Amino acid sequence: KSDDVNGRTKMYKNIVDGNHQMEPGMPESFNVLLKEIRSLGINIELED
């Protein structure tokens, strides 16, 4: 139910097909935070 744009559609399909399966992905607000942090003189990234 969050800003995960690629998750709301897929959960809706899983419901209408009665799958009831969820894949988290990543909230978009976290990407918002990363983009606004990189707006200043601070590097930030996520390793593997």
């Binding site: 607000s29 935070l33 200043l40």
Partner: protein, 49 residues
């Protein structure tokens, strides 16, 4: 150049140095740090707000 350095400082933090206001409004502006800090920042409403 002093104007430019001041403007960059205000863009980063207006509350610290200088006072920038909008048209007909004396309230300060929301700098790149303002939307990070305070009750109305990104970190707020991040805690499941």
């Amino acid at each position: 150049k002093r104007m430019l350095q001041e403007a960059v400082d205000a863009l980063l933090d207006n509350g610290r140095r200088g006072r920038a206001i909008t048209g007909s409004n004396k309230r300060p502006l929301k700098s790149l740090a303002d939307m990070i800090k305070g009750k109305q920042g990104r970190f707020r409403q991040n805690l499941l707000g």
